[model samples]
Target: AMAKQTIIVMSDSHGDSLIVEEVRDRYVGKVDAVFHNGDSELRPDSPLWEGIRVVKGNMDFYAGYPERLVTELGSTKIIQTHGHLFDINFNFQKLDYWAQEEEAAICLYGHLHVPSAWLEGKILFLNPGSISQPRGTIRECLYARVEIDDSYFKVDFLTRDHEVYPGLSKEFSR
Candidate 1:
């Protein structure tokens, strides 16, 4: 492995600050960055989100958070958002274009309240899922931790209890 960085990403909490706080406390100092893709249902200034990078979700009325954010982690450019702007539930074709426009290496978003990840060309798209309001038949609350080590990108989907999710964690080449 070459240089490396670790990031924790989650979304769609929708008022469950305790879970978010728990995650923060759990991963503090263990990660290089944290991201929330939105639906937090709390004011932007809430201490719950103090150090985490976040964007506003469709359900959010607060005007403080950005609709989207482009930032860097290590040598990678990451795009973060709530995914409504791109109609994620239907498809991420538009998001792919947006990522290309920004020359981003990774895209993170949440809206379907489900965890998912895939690659489009060299770009990685991910949804860390919902920490609070999970949908469908998910057996546990979902979130993701990403580690970028040189040309390898590793993703680990976890439960609110911090257990590794079966079949959801994998590594990819960047």
Candidate 2:
């Protein structure tokens, strides 16, 4: 809660302009930047991504690898990706390892359409889940808002539905 209020993290639009608009309107003048983690399938030149910093997901066909990406806000080291190259969706998740390799302080990614967050080896791994077709919660579409300032950060997971399906909210630790 320093001078800066917060920075919003949004992802996995999958072509939902309304959610993007929601992102633009709901977070207006409230966020530092919008980091897109792909599934918008938008290219770097598209109007949809004009003001956003996005990394290629498996959907971002034109995006390159390391498919891994890094950016910064204030003094925070932020990483973005689709979670595919790291093979997380099918459940053989390895994004955390790569983040450690990159020594990222904060990691953001999407593709599972299910909210996930955890701390791994001095790293914070987060997925806003899906904006259009969230799976676990069986709730409305979902996304996350992340705020980082100084040595503290806060992340909010939002979905039209927050029911978090059967055992959805707590599935990663095991």
RMSD (Cα, Å) for all candidates, in order, is 1.4, 4.6
- Give candidate 2 misplaced runs (Cα > 4 Å): 1-5, 25-29, 62-66, 90-93, 160-174
Best by TM-score: 1
lDDT of 2 by residue, 30-141 (tens): 5777766877755566665545667766766664433656787656678888777777856634776677777787788887776777777666777777777667645556
- lDDT per residue (tens digit) for residues 1-174 in model 1: 457888999999988889889988887677888899999888998887776889999988988999999888767899988989888778878988899999888999988898887878888889897888788667578999988876788999988888888988878987
TM-score on alpha carbons, each prediction: 0.94, 0.77
Q: Pairing residues by index, what is the TM-score of model 2? A: 0.77
| Model 1, C-alpha of 82: deviation from truth (Å) | 0.5
> Would you list the clashing residue pairs of candidate 1?
none
